Amino acid sequence: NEQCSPQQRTTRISGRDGLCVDVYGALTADGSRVILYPCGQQQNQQWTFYPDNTIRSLGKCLATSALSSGSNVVITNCDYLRYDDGWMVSSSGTMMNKSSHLVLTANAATSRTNLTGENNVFAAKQAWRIGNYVEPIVTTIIGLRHMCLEATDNDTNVWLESCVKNKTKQYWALYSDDTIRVNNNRNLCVSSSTDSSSKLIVIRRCDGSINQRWVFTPQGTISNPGYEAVMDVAQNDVYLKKIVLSSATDKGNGQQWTVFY
Amino acid sequence: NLSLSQSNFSADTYKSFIKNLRKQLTIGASYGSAGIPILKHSVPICERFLLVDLTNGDNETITLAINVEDAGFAAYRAADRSYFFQNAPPIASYVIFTDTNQNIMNFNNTFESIEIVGGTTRSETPLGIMHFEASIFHLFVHDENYVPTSFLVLIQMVLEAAKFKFIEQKVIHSIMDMEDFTPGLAMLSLEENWTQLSLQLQASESLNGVFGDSVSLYNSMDEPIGVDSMYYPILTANMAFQLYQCP
Ligand SMILES: *[C@@H]1O[C@H](CO)[C@@H](O[C@@H]2O[C@H](CO)[C@@H](O[C@@H]3O[C@H](CO)[C@@H](O)[C@H](O)[C@@H]3O[C@@H]3OC[C@@H](O)[C@H](O)[C@H]3O)[C@H](O)[C@H]2NC(C)=O)[C@H](O[C@@H]2O[C@@H](C)[C@@H](O)[C@@H](O)[C@@H]2O)[C@H]1NC(C)=O
Ligand SMILES: *[C@@H]1O[C@H](CO)[C@@H](O[C@@H]2O[C@H](CO)[C@@H](O)[C@H](O)[C@H]2NC(C)=O)[C@H](O)[C@H]1NC(C)=O
Ligand SMILES: *[C@@H]1O[C@H](CO)[C@@H](O)[C@H](O)[C@H]1NC(C)=O
Ligand SMILES: OC[C@H]1O[C@H](O)[C@H](O)[C@@H](O)[C@H]1O
16 A cells, blocks of 8 residues: 555644744745744745655755754755754654754744744644644534533633533634634633642633643543643532643543534 | 443433443554554454444344444344345354344445435434434334435444544534434545545654645534644544554
8 A cells, every 4th residue: 555655745834823834035045944924825834744754845854953942943955964863743743853852943923933943841832733724723622511611701711511502602713833712812722720829720811831732632631741631620520610730540531522623 | 242222322321332332442453653543453253343232212122243343334133133234244144143044235334335225315314312213123123215224324323423523422412402413514524534534644654644645524614624634633532543554
């Protein structure tokens, strides 16, 4: 089956705030930098993947420019990277230089922001969707007792309520940066607690942090990989109106979730 | 045998059923980067079938044989009678429903074949508890003019829901709303592409999670979403297991 060994594929890479990985001005010189930029059909947002672990736009290779954190990711001649292992993408969308362990990162959300190779901390600003379809995915999120997450208290809290199809606040926009956004106000992100004395999951202004990065795992959990923990119904009791961050256990059903889209 | 009865068909019960069905089917499953279990393959015919019992509003019961390689029905028993798709593994007769009066249905276990023979499509075939109930009845007596749509119903309500949480959830929403439904583009596009998604996922290993080909999955607003990699929650948090496709 030659289908099992695809020779290449051309796609986009979208990340923070739904913006795209873009070679600035489509410049083709060795070391021409990659940036955040609104998604479109332009050649310099087109990334071709290969079995050799190279990611290419404009015939050249996505790369780091430095062994230490803080420097731009660029495109360079692919011949230069002839003896390097290249990129590895984790199943959560972390794009990592195999050798240096540095990861594709967006230190700000605005258009034209320089992408840099940074130390991995599982922030949302380090989370990428590799894929031609770059739009947020609108969904309901179904948990315990078949109830829906609802955004509450003027979009400041979140908990389970009986699912209602019309209901605006039960709709969630799943961004390419692994954020879970209030559909109706996409500046607002579902966030793990910032007060250490609480585990309460809440809604806050999107900021690219570890607290706002979520992963829908094949095993039915909603994971925050940075905090090695998962979204959970407090005490397996939906009537407590509280969703917390917990270690992954099989003791109840409160760590099980479904996406309905 | 794993069991779902009409007399005890809540959302929770249905959910346990589908959950336990996935577990059983995925015993010995292999795993890739995606983490979605891949069904066993080249399984000896003596081990290839998993039996499930469905019971309707009469206290009446059929036992369906699921091929653990492809999560499809091969055959079923009703009392002293059994029925095999002509599609079935050709030795299945010697292994399942041995002392019954075995019969061959003159069609394959595929939606295409079933829709041609019955003259009716999934889009126009309702799904719900009483359709589940009645489908079982029609199969028990083997009333030939209802057998195809009965399969459309049961395949989707048992096997395709096992394949896809989305579909599981349509059946849950149906149970709780006390509302029948017909599948839309969203559900059908998953059914259509089970095989292709399995292939792309397994092939994606050699391209950092990226598919050799895009797959169109509709949402509930009938908008197409091109899934050309492993990085879509609508795939990853939906497809519960895959057909074995690549070494
Ligand atoms: C997004 O990426 C772009 C592309 O790299 C950044 O543009 C550049 O900014 C550099 C400074 O951070 C410039 O380097 C300097 O150039 C002047 C010119 O002589 C020099 O006086 C400076 O000392 C420095 O020269 C370097 O000195 C240190 C040495 O180690 C090094 O070898 C020297 O090159 C660079 O020329 C400039 N390039 C371009 C194409 O504009 C951009 O940097 C941000 O904007 C630039 C224009 C400048 O304002 C920077 O200070 C500012 O950080 C970067 N954007 C951001 C937000 O970081
Ligand atoms: C991944 O990171 C490593 C280490 O920073 C990069 O390796 C260097 O690559 C340059 C250009 O080929 C060489 O001139 C250096 O000698 C290499 N240094 C080391 C420590 O190996 C590598 O190029 C990066 N690859 C990608 C695809 O980003
Ligand atoms: C049934 O499947 C076979 C291959 O197994 C195919 O040749 C044939 O077209 C199908 N026939 C029917 C009865 O639809
Ligand atoms: O200024 C940035 C901008 O430059 C050009 O317009 C390119 O076509 C865009 O893709 C983008 O990189």
